[PDB]
């Protein structure tokens, strides 16, 4: 808040690290809210610029990943590229 920021790589390492920790909490909080509100199983895996791991799971990471491996059907499967296109068209 206070000024609109463009969605592009933050140039300044320290700014990048503060923004990262803020938005990581925000993302895990929203994941938690969704899981509880809509009774869903969510897994979130984050690797930062320094390749350090941070993970959230609603119930248990292993259970969700097992259910994922043995889904055996087409599903909504999005990348940064596909997302960029979906946002530009609105």
């Amino acid at each position: 808040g206070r000024k609109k920021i463009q969605i592009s790589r933050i140039l300044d390492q320290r700014n990048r690290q503060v923004t990262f920790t803020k938005r990581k909490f925000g993302l895990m909080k929203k994941a938690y809210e969704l899981s509880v509100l809509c009774d869903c199983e969510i897994a979130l895996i984050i690797f930062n610029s320094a390749n350090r791991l941070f993970q959230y799971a609603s119930t248990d990471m292993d259970r969700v990943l097992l259910k994922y491996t043995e889904y055996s059907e087409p599903h909504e499967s999005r990348t940064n590229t596909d997302i960029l296109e979906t946002l530009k068209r609105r």
Binding site: L11, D12, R14, N15
Partner: protein, 55 residues
């Protein structure tokens, strides 16, 4: 814990565009006009200088 007025900040910024650093007397003179303390102008300029490099 209170923020400065947009008139206080306008003059602080206008002055910062001319000079990144103030002398103690210069600082006191400005503080008087803006209705701030010497400490407040000192630390404002310190913070603004830091943020200027974090662009």
């Amino acid at each position: 814990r209170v923020l400065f007025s947009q008139a206080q900040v306008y003059e602080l910024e206008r002055r910062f565009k001319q000079q990144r650093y103030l002398s103690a007397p210069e600082r006191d003179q400005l503080a008087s006009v803006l209705k701030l303390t010497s400490t407040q102008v000192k630390i404002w300029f310190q913070n603004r200088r830091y943020k200027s490099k974090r662009q």
